[PDB]
Amino acid sequence: SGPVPSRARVYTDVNTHRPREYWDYESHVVEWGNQDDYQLVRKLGRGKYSEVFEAINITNNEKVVVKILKPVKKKKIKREIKILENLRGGPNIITLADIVKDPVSRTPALVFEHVNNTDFKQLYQTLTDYDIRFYMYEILKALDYCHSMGIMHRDVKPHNVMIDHEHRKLRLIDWGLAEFYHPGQEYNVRVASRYFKGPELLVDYQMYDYSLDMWSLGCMLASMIFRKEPFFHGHDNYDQLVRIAKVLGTEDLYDYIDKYNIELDPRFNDILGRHSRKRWERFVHSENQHLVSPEALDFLDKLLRYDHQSRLTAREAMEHPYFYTVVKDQA
């Protein structure tokens, strides 16, 4: 028979209770601003679906970030715009300032608030135990808010986390892969970058939910406290699952497959092997021990579970002893 269905443990029907317009992005009508309000200053980078620039809004002298899109299905641009508008003003969510189009080229561009970011390949190695808890807590506020609003980010990784360390300011960006959660919906598993993909994506289990973001968050926490980037270093999507199995063990994986009646791709049989569940101590050493504590390991263990239903929710994660000092300092 086929796979056993699943439903999100929390915020299951928040979209069902909303008016259709909230989540039916295919019928969203884009509100366009004036492209002449912005002047491109410099290129920040490119990508498969966009080129991004730093720009100046000449009507108020505000520094902005402009993401000029390459050909993308209009429903997907509508999805990103709709999600950004629904989440506007939410804790640590990037602000979509404007949406403009080149009148000649017909090329759309999304205009975002600017964050004076310090690239993670320099910032992360300088972070203290307290910095890691503080910033993890800030990401959790962004995830609990978007999940409570019926949205999964589906692309949580260091590149999508903008940090202005001088001002202790964090923003979760790039909502281009984000989706609305609907109970019973089967989603595309070809989402997220390889190292952050949850087991549900790797075994082709389509009835996933917000908990997908908690796995990616666990991958980020592990890379930060162990200074091991990436934490699960797969050569491809098949080997990515092997890398997780070598840490979490094959027994919990096969119990996960059996529980949801998942048909495993036959390629997996001869590569998964048999592996015991390792203890987190084998990743601890003299140069990372200052970031590792029993509460960091307890929290990590509760995020990195094969069974998406058994991972902490963003709200349960925020109540973890790992954040007691951050919570006390914010009060």
Ligand SMILES: N#Cc1cnn2c(NC3CC3)cc(-c3nnn(CCN4CCCCC4)c3-c3ccc(=O)[nH]c3)nc12
């Ligand atoms: N939204 C937003 C946003 C706010 N600030 N801010 C900054 N600030 C730093 C300039 C100080 C940079 C970027 C950015 N830089 N490169 N890329 C593109 C991806 N990059 C290409 C080079 C290699 C690594 C991946 C982006 C971006 C913007 C929007 C987006 O949706 N995805 C990504 N985005 C933002």
